[PDB]
């Protein structure tokens, strides 16, 4: 619900979630940061099985939900591993409950964390960002959306999560783009 509560609840999830074998998956993903990875990829269905309220909040209030998850990673690093100097670690959510085709993206998807399937038709770089043009896959027929990431090459089929942002496109319009939270 509120920010402080979400942080505490993410820390509990990271510490206490276990897979079908009783293994604390997210403890391992945290120790991967001490060798290193600079993200923790979180399976949303793991989160939903543990804390369905928190998982719903990630979808409906992504800016706050993602930020809280990141602050929880820092808390666990400090308290459980005595590390405070790893720097910013991104929380990257995948396996959301609904998947959109690019053509399905609408007004109802603003201000949410969304999951989109497509085929990559372009990949570019304008430092420090990577960009992807994500188009409807031919076997679903095309519309496209550009994604910005801070993994995939032209021709690759992908599933991405992210939040809709805009770019001023020069008649000028604010074209919807996706700020990418996770891609595979």
Numbering used by the authors: 1 to 35, 38 to 130, 182 to 194, 200 to 208, 214 to 233, 237 to 250
Lines quoted from the article behind this entry:
We designed the PfMCMN-ΔZFD construct to disrupt the short intersubunit antiparallel β-sheet interaction (P130 carbonyl–F240 amide and V132 amide–P238 carbonyl). Because these interactions exclusively involve main-chain atoms, they cannot be predictably disrupted by side-chain mutagenesis. Instead, we deleted residues 131–181, which deletes the Zn-binding B-subdomain. This deletion removes the V132 amide altogether and requires a different orientation for the P130 carbonyl to accommodate the tight β-hairpin needed to accommodate the deletion. The structure shows that P130 adopts a cis-proline conformation in order to generate the tight β-hairpin of the deletion, and thus the carbonyl of this residue is no longer available to interact with a neighboring subunit. The PfMCMN-ΔZFD and PfMCMN-F179A mutants are exclusively monomeric at all concentrations tested. All of these mutants (PfMCMN-ΔZFD, PfMCMN-F179A and PfMCMN-βT) have wild-type MSSB motifs available for interaction with ssDNA, but no binding is observed.
The Minichromosome Maintenance (MCM) complex forms an essential hexameric-ring helicase that unwinds DNA at the replication fork (1–3). MCM proteins have three conserved domains: an N-terminal domain (MCMN) that mediates the head-to-head interaction of the initial double-hexamer; a conserved AAA+ ATPase domain; and a short helix-turn-helix domain at the C-terminus. Crystal structures of the N-terminal domains of Methanobacterium thermautotrophicus (MtMCMN), Sulfolobus solfataricus (SsoMCMN) and Pyrococcus furiosis (PfMCMN) show a consistent hexameric ring structure with three subdomains: a helical subdomain-A, a Zn-binding subdomain-B and an OB-fold subdomain-C. The crystal structure of PfMCMN bound to single-stranded DNA (ssDNA) revealed that subdomain-C binds ssDNA in the plane of the hexameric ring via conserved residues defined as the MCM single-stranded DNA-binding motif (MSSB).
